[PDB]
Amino acid sequence: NKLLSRMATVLVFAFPVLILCVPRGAGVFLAGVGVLALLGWRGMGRAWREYSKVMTPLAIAVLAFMLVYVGSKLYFHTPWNVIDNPSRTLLAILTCWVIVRAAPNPAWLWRGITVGLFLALLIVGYQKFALNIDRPSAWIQAIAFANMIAALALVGFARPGDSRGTHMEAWVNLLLGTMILMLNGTRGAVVAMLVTSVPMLMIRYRRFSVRMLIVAVCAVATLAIGAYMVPDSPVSKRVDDAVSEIQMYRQGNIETSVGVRLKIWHIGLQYFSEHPWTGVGVGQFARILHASEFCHETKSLACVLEHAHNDIVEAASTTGIPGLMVMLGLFLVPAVLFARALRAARSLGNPQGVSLGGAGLGVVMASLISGLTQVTMAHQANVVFYAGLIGLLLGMAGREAHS
Amino acid sequence: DIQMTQSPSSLSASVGDRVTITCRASQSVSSAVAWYQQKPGKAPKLLIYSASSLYSGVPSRFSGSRSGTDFTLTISSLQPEDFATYYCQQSYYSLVTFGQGTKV
Amino acid sequence: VQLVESGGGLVQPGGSLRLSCAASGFNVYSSSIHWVRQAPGKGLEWVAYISSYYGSTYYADSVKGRFTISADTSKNTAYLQMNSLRAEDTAVYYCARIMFKWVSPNMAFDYWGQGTLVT
Ligand SMILES: CC(C)=CCC/C(C)=C/COP(=O)(O)OP(=O)(O)O
Numbered sequence: 146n147k148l149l150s151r152m153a154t155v156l157v158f159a160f161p162v163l164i165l166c167v168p169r170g171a172g173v174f175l176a177g178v179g180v181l182a183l184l185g186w187r188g189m190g191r192a193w194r195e196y197s198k199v200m201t202p203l204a205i206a207v208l209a210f211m212l213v214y215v216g217s218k219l220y221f222h223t224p225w226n227v228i229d230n231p232s233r234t235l236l237a238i239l240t241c242w243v244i245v246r247a248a249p250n251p252a253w254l255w256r257g258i259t260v261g262l263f264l265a266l267l268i269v270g271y272q273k274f275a276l277n278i279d280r281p282s283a284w285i286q287a288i289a290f291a292n293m294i295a296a297l298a299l300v301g302f303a304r305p306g307d308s309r310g311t312h313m314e315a316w317v318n319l320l321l322g323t324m325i326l327m328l329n330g331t332r333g334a335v336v337a338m339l340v341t342s343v344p345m346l347m348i349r350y351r352r353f354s355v356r357m358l359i360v361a362v363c364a365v366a367t368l369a370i371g372a373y374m375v376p377d378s379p380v381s382k383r384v385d386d387a388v389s390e391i392q393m394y395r396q397g398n399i400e401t402s403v404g405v406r407l408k409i410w411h412i413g414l415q416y417f418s419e420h421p422w423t424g425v426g427v428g429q430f431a432r433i434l435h436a437s438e439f440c441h442e443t444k445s446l447a448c449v450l451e452h453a454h455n456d457i458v459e460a461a462s463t464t465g466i467p468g469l470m471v472m473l474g475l476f477l478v479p480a481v482l483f484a485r486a487l488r489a490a491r492s493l494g495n496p497q498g499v500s501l502g503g504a505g506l507g508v509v510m511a512s513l514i515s516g517l518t519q520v521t522m523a524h525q526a527n528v529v530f531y532a533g534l535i536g537l538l539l540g541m542a543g544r545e546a547h548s
Numbered sequence: 549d550i551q552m553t554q555s556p557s558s559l560s561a562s563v564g565d566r567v568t569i570t571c572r573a574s575q576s577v578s579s580a581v582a583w584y585q586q587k588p589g590k591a592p593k594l595l596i597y598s599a600s601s602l603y604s605g606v607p608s609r610f611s612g613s614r615s616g617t618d619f620t621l622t623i624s625s626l627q628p629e630d631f632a633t634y635y636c637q638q639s640y641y642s643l644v645t646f647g648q649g650t651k652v
Numbered sequence: 653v654q655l656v657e658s659g660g661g662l663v664q665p666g667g668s669l670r671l672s673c674a675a676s677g678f679n680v681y682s683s684s685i686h687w688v689r690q691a692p693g694k695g696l697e698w699v700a701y702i703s704s705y706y707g708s709t710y711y712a713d714s715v716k717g718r719f720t721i722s723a724d725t726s727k728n729t730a731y732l733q734m735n736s737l738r739a740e741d742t743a744v745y746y747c748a749r750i751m752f753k754w755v756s757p758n759m760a761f762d763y764w765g766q767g768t769l770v771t
Contacts, residue, residue, distance in 0.1 A: 549713065579758070580757075580758035580759070580760075582760040582761075584696075584761075586696070591746055591764040591765065591766065591767055592696070592746075592761075592764060593764075594751075594760060594761060594762050597751060597756050597760040598756055598757075598758065598760075601756075603762065635695065635696055637760070639758035639759040639760060640758060642710050643698070643710060643712065643713075644686075644698045644759065645698065646688075646695060646696040646697065646698060647695070648695055649695035649696065
């Protein structure tokens with residue numbers, strides 16, 4: 146009983162370091178969560194029942210998503226390799242179930258987060274300033290690494306505590322995250338993290354109400370508008386570019402970064418309108434482009450992209466209305482569960498549970514914002530990291546709220 | 549920097565027989581390998597980016613693959629306009645490097 | 653989208669010459685410009701480039717300390733200032749523009765220039 150808790154708090158402490166710093170750390174963490182499950186031999190049947198207000202919605206959402214993706218492959222004969230990445234979201238079920246069976250200590254998650262962030266900063270600094278690398282990602286893809294950095298920085302920003310030494314240990318998390326993100330480019334992750342950290346400022350300060358948030362976002366908007374009124378400001382330099390890009394797209398000159406991605410979106414949405422219920426199927430987005438009228442009369446980069454670069458548009462065009470609903474569910478059901486746990490924790494006091502729920506909600510929001518400009522299911526590392534993090538956070542939050 | 553060797557340095561094959569080009573790498577370049585085709589006295593044109601994705605206006609005959617640090621381009625069949633020099637590049641390191649350049 | 657460069661000619665060793673790469677159909681300060689040279693009857697060789705927005709510059713081993721790459725958003729042109737020329741720098745110099753960052757995470761040249769000859 147006690148060893149199950151100790152070997153689980155050690156695992157939650159080591160999870161960020163394994164995921165980021167260790168090369169094959171995802172497999173190591175999977176083996177760790179699977180060997181903890183082999184010691185829950187006598188339990189794990191009396192763990193699901195009392196935590197069925199949190200475990201069952203997650204299991205139902207994951208099973209429905211898997212069934213929809215399998216049914217969008219049975220009807221449209223596709224190679225089985227298109228569902229390997231979706232097959233990795235089943236690990237959220239296992240992670241949450243293991244966590245709820247063996248109660249961890251959430252106080253060791255935050256120290257693990259900050260240690261992982263610091264060590265990843267050191268690794269990226271070495272991989273950029275000495276072994277010159279264009280985009281210094283530790284051992285994985287740049288996009289997946291950036292998403293992991295953003296998610297873990299948000300998690301670390303939700304430090305449970307009020308002492309002066311805790312706020313300066315949570316702002317350091319954002320500082321390390323933004324340094325790591327700027328080291329490997331991918332400014333979109335920086336923008337997403339900075340945007341989604343503003344709602345987190347209510348979790349961060351248990352004095353910061355909603356009016357103080359409305360005025361804060363008003364001040365941010367005023368600062369953003371002030372930049373556009375300075376003629377030489379770089380913000381006006383990267384905003385006028387997008388404005389001119391939109392204007393060029395509104396006539397025939399669609400051969401640009403904004404224009405190319407606003408043209409695959411239109412082709413995807415026009416096909417989704419044609420076939421609402423069943424699209425081409427899971428994956429197979431290239432069929433929409435190759436059967437389109439624009440590609441048959443124009444030679445451009447928009448006809449070579451394997452998949453769309455927006456999660457909602459890609460899901461709607463490829464796997465239809467049921468697939469769109471289940472894809473939105475994979476990100477909305479955890480949000481509802483986190484809100485339900487946060488409300489109970491706040492009604493009970495217990496600042497650790499409230500901070501955990503806030504961190505989960507921020508992770509969900511950041512994942513949605515990232516999916517606004519990319520497909521999360523494309524990268525296996527991103528999928529497995531998201532599944533594991535959501536499972537662990539949901540399990541710990543449910544354990545804190547229920548008891 | 550990072551050094552690449554291409555083999556063969558120059559090959560000769562008739563039309564219809566598939567050819568494969570091997571590009572090596574001194575250090576570990578993950579996927580930042582691109583392939584170009586240069587015809588005599590003209591600017592090179594991109595063929596494959598990220599070692600497995602074709603570019604616009606490139607026939608489906610061209611295809612690339614990765615096996616660890618062994619990056620290989622192959623052509624399913626040679627049309628009369630496929631006779632040109634090919635190069636392989638790394639973009640993982642900040643100082644990019646081109647291969648020696650095979651010739652068909 | 654078009655990249656046009658001019659400025660090649662006869663330069664005795666120890667001289668200086670500037671290559672201007674005028675661009676059209678896109679914005680230079682948004683994307684990045686890479687310079688690639690090819691010696692007569694030899695393979696392609698990279699020399700320098702600039703970053704997208706920050707303007708950070710990297711140079712090859714042989715040309716560092718003597719080559720000064722720069723950009724001018726007002727005229728939407730990119731320059732490579734060549735200094736302390738030697739007989740080993742004779743080549744045809746091409747421009748290059750990387751693909752969209754979201755399409756390819758790593759740099760890969762998609763549009764090139766017509767190329768200029770410097771002796
Ligand atoms: C809700 C908000 C404010 C979302 C902002 C997302 C963002 C920075 C998009 C910029 O596009 P991009 O071309 O930079 O995307 P990417 O870098 O991923 O290719």
